[PDB]
Design a protein around this ligand. Structure first.
Ligand code: NAI
Ligand code: NAI
Ligand code: NAI
Ligand code: NAI
Lengths: 255, 255, 255, 255
C-alpha cells in the first residue's frame, strides 16, 4: 500500500456505495481517517459519514468546515459523487439535463472550492476527481453525462495549474465498472433477470480488451496511487482505468 | 469558396463582433442567408441581426422559430457566443463562475436543442461549436472558462454521435485570435496603455509557432469548411486553429 | 474549391490508386500541376507520374530534384504512399515489420527531407501527411502499421514546429475508406464474393457513426483544405476524417 | 510498496544510469529479481547486469533466454533504453536519424518480441515502455527523437490490444527529469559551465507547473505501479509524469 496515506484525513464524496465505497474502504485499509459526504447512509462502515448533497454549496461548505474542525486537517479530497440518466438532447427535459451537470460538475466545483483553503494548510495535499472513459470515447443518449465528464477534466486541469506546486489535482477515467449504477444500466436494458443481466454485462466486458468489466477496487487503486506521494510529480492528468477500451477501434482485421 | 453554402440558412451566435462577426461575414461571402443571434447590435452589417440572449431559452427558441418561418430552413448553426473573466476557484464568486458556464455551455446547449428539430428537416445539416485550444492546453486563473470549453467538446461529441448520419457536429479550437476579448485580456493584465497592450499581444504571438496571433478570418475559414459538404465524413472532432500552440513544449533545445 | 491552389506544383506520393489517386485528381481539378511519385503506372491520368519507390532515398531525392528543375517550384507535398500487412508481433517476420515502418514512416521522412529545401523557396508551402484514425484508436494484429501511423504524427509535429511560420505541416487521420487496400482487407477476411465483400464493408461502415465507410474524395477534400491558404493558421495537427469513429465507445445504452 | 512485486523477475533496459537505474533500484527495493540489459556497466549495483545492445536482436534474444533459464520466468519488462541527438530534418544525417529510430523504437520492438513468449507463461505479465511527454507536446530540432516517442505509443497500444487480457502493456510519459541525458542537453545548449548548466535546468524546471524538473525516482514510482497488480485493469495507456507540463499553455492571464 501507500504508507504515506496513513492517518491522513481523506474526504470522499458519494462513498456510500459503488466506486466511492470502494475508494473509502481502500483509504481505510491504508490507515487514513476517511469521511464520506453523500446522500445515503452506508450503514455499518469503518469510515465516517456526513449527510451532504453536493449540489448544495452551503451544506458542502458546512460539512467540510466541520471536518477540518473535528480532524484538524484535510489532505485528500476525492470527488466521486455522480449520477447518470439517459436521453437525447431532444427528449431529456432541460431540468434533468441541468441536474446532471449540477451533480457531476458543480458538486466537484463546490467540494473543491471549500476544501482547498484547508488543504493548502497541510503538506502535499491532493485532489482526485472521478471522470470517465467518456471524457474521450462516448456513448449514445448520454448528452448531459458526457458533457459533465468532459467538464470535470477541464476543472481538474485548472485546479492543478492554479495550485501547483503545493497541491496536486488529477482525474481517474474508468470504463465499465461493476457498480450499482452499471447494474442499473443493464437492468434498464434487459430487465431484472440475473441471468440476462450477467449476459448484458458480459457483452460489455467483451467489448473491453481485458474481456471483462472492471471492479470498484481497481479504480480505488488508481485513486490511492494519485492521492499518494508516489505520484508527487503527477498533476493535471487523467489516469485511464479502462481495460484498454479507449484505444480499441471496432474494426475487424484478418486473423 | 464552397459552392454548396450558397442559399443555405446559417445562424451564428455572438456575431456582433470578433470571431463571430468574421464567421458571419465569411458565410455572407459564400452566398448564405446569415442571421446573428447576439445581445449587442453589430449595426451596419451585411447579415441579419436579432437581439437574443443565449442564456434565455424562451428568447433562443423564439429567435430560431422566427428564422425557420422566415427562411424556410436552417442548415448551419455556429455556436460562438462566449465570455471570459478571471480568478482562481477561491476568488471568483460562485455566481460569476456559474454565469460563465451558463453562457459558454448552456448557451450552446439551448441553441442546439431548439435548432436541431428544424435542422434535421433541412439539407446537409451541420453544427459547428467554437471551443478553444484550452480544451487541451490551459491558462491560469481561468477555472470556469477552461471548464466550459472542455464541456463544449463533450456536447459536440454527443450531438455528433446522437444525430449521425443526418446531422454533423464538430468544434473549432482556436488559440490566441485578434479580437476584443483578447484586447480586454491584455488590458486587464498590462493596463490601458495602447503600446503596452501591443507589446503583450506581440509576446503571446511569439509563443505560437506561427510567430503571430491568429486572425478572426482564419477561424472563419475552418468553420466554413466544417459546415460545408467538403467535410461530409467529418463529425465529432475539434479542428485546432492554433498556429501550432498545442503541440509546442516550452522547453528549449540546442540550435 | 481552393482557388489559391491553382497552378501550384503539388507532389503526391502513392497517387496511382486509392486515396492518393483521389488526392491527385482533386488537386488537378483545383488547377494545380500535380506529380505522382509511386511504384505503379496509373496509366491515362491528367497528372504527371515518376516511377519512384519511397523507401529509396536516392530515387526520392532524384525525383524531387527533377520536379523542381522541370516545374520551377514545389508548393505542396502530400505524403500518402503506404502499405499494410497483418500479424501479431510474434507471427510477422522482423523483416516484414521493418518493411512496413520503412514505407509508412521512412518514405514520409525521405520525401519531406528532400522536398523541404525547395518548398521554402516558394510562398507558404504546405505538407500534408496521411496518417490514420489508428493514430488514436487501433485494430488488432496490426503492430507495425499502428506503430508507423503514430510515428507519422510525431514527424508531422516536428516538421511543423521546426519550419513554422514559413512552411506548415499537418496530417489527415482517415478511418475506413473505400479503396483497394480496404477492399483487399475485406477479401482477406471473407473471400472474393462481391456479395460477401459488400456485407463485410457494410459491417465496418455500421461501426462508424456515419453508418458507412468513407470515400476517397472525402479524404481529398481535407487534404486540399489543409494544403490551401484557408488553413493558414493551422499547423502541427491531425484532421480526423473518420465519420465519428474515434469518439465512439462500443457500449450500448438504453434506447 | 506493492507486495506482489516480490520475487517477480523484472528486466529493465538501459538501467546503468538515469531513469533506468532508478527503476531497477525501485524494483530491487520491492524485492524483485532485477536484470539490467544495457551497453554500459553500472558497476557496483544491487541488481544484475548483462552487457546487451538493444539494437542487436541476436544479443537481445540471448540475454532474455539466459534470464528465463536462470530465473524460471519473466514477469515484467521495462523498455527504457534510449538516446537523443539534435538537428532539423535537413541537418541531421540520415544515418543518425535512422539510429535514433533503431534504438528508441526497434530496441523496444526486439525486447518485447523476444520476451513476450516467456512472459505469457508467467504470472501477471506486464510491459512498461518509457515514452516521453513529447508523445504530446514537442521540442524543436528533435525530429527523430519525437517521431520515435510517438512510435513507442503505437507499439504500446498494439501490444496491449494483441495480448490482453493475459498481458498488460502501458507507457510512462515523463517531462524533464534530472538525468545525464538532460545534463547533456543543457551542456549542448549553454556549454560546459556548471553554474550555467544549473541555470538552464532551473529555467526548464520553472516551465513546469510543479516549478522544478522531476526526479528519476518519481518516474520509477509510476513504473512500479503500472507493473503491479494494483494496475490490473490498466492497459494501453500512457501515464504522464510531467509535473503538469502537457496541460500548460504558455499564455499569461491577469493575476
Ligand atoms: N460505474 C461505472 O462504470 C463508472 C462510474 N464513473 C463515475 O464514478 C463515480 C461513482 O459511480 P458509481 O459508483 O458507479 O455510482 P453509484 O450510483 O453506485 O454511486 C454514486 C454515489 O453518489 C452519491 N450521490 C449521488 N448524487 C449525490 C448528491 N447530489 N450528493 C451527494 N452524494 C450523491 C450516492 O449517494 C452514491 O453513494 C461517478 O462520478 C460516476 O460518474 C465513471 C466511469 C464509469
Ligand atoms: N479570441 C480568442 O483568442 C479565442 C476565442 N475563442 C472563442 O471564440 C468565441 C468568440 O470569441 P471572441 O470573438 O474572441 O470574443 P468577443 O468578446 O469579441 O465576442 C463575443 C460575442 O459573444 C456575444 N455574446 C456574449 N454573451 C452573449 C449572450 N449572453 N447572448 C448572446 N450573445 C452573447 C457578444 O455579443 C459578442 O458578439 C467564444 O466562444 C470564445 O470563447 C476560443 C479561443 C480563442
Ligand atoms: N484505405 C483506408 O481506409 C485508409 C488508408 N490510410 C492511408 O492512406 C494512404 C493511402 O491508402 P490507400 O489508398 O488505402 O491504399 P492503396 O494500396 O490503394 O494505395 C497505396 C499507394 O501507395 C503506393 N505505394 C506503396 N508502396 C510504395 C513504395 N514503396 N513507393 C512508392 N509508392 C508506393 C502504391 O503504388 C499505391 O498507389 C496510406 O498511407 C494508408 O495507410 C489511412 C487510413 C485509412
Ligand atoms: N531524462 C528525461 O527528461 C526523459 C527521459 N525519457 C526517456 O527515459 C529513458 C531513459 O532516459 P534517461 O535516463 O534520461 O537517459 P540516460 O542517457 O541517462 O540513460 C539511457 C540508458 O540507455 C542505455 N542505452 C542507450 N543506448 C543503448 C543501446 N543501444 N543498448 C542498450 N542500452 C542502451 C544506456 O546504457 C543508459 O543506461 C529514455 O527512453 C528517454 O527517452 C523520456 C522523457 C524525459
Amino acid at each position: 500500500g501507500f504508507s504515506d496515506l496513513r492517518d491522513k484525513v481523506v474526504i470522499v464524496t458519494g462513498a456510500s456505495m459503488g466506486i466511492g465505497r470502494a475508494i473509502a474502504e481502500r483509504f481505510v485499509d491504508e490507515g487514513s481517517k476517511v469521511i464520506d459526504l453523500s446522500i445515503h447512509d452506508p450503514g455499518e462502515a469503518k469510515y465516517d459519514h456526513i449527510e451532504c448533497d453536493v449540489t448544495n454549496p452551503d451544506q458542502v461548505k458546512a460539512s467540510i468546515d466541520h471536518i477540518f474542525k473535528e480532524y484538524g486537517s484535510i489532505s485528500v479530497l476525492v470527488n466521486n459523487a455522480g449520477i447518470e440518466s439517459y436521453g437525447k438532447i431532444e427528449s431529456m427535459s432541460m431540468g434533468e439535463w441541468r441536474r446532471i451537470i449540477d451533480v457531476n460538475l458543480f458538486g466537484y466545483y463546490y467540494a473543491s472550492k471549500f476544501a482547498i483553503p484547508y488543504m493548502i494548510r497541510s503538506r502535499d495535499p491532493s485532489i482526485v476527481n472521478i471522470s470517465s472513459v467518456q471524457a474521450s470515447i462516448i456513448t449514445k443518449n448520454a448528452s448531459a453525462y458526457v458533457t459533465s465528464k468532459h467538464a470535470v477534466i477541464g476543472l481538474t486541469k485548472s485546479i492543478a495549474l492554479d495550485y501547483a506546486p503545493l497541491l496536486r489535482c488529477n482525474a481517474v477515467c474508468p470504463a465499465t465498472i461493476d457498480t450499482p449504477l452499471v447494474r442499473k444500466a443493464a437492468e434498464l436494458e434487459v430487465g431484472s433477470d440475473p441471468m440476462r443481466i450477467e449476459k448484458k454485462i458480459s457483452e460489455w466486458g467483451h467489448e473491453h480488451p481485458m474481456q471483462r468489466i472492471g471492479k470498484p477496487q481497481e479504480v480505488a487503486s488508481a485513486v490511492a496511487f494519485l492521492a499518494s506521494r508516489e505520484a508527487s510529480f503527477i498533476t493535471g492528468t487523467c489516469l485511464y482505468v479502462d481495460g484498454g477500451l479507449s484505444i480499441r477501434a471496432p474494426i475487424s482485421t484478418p486473423e
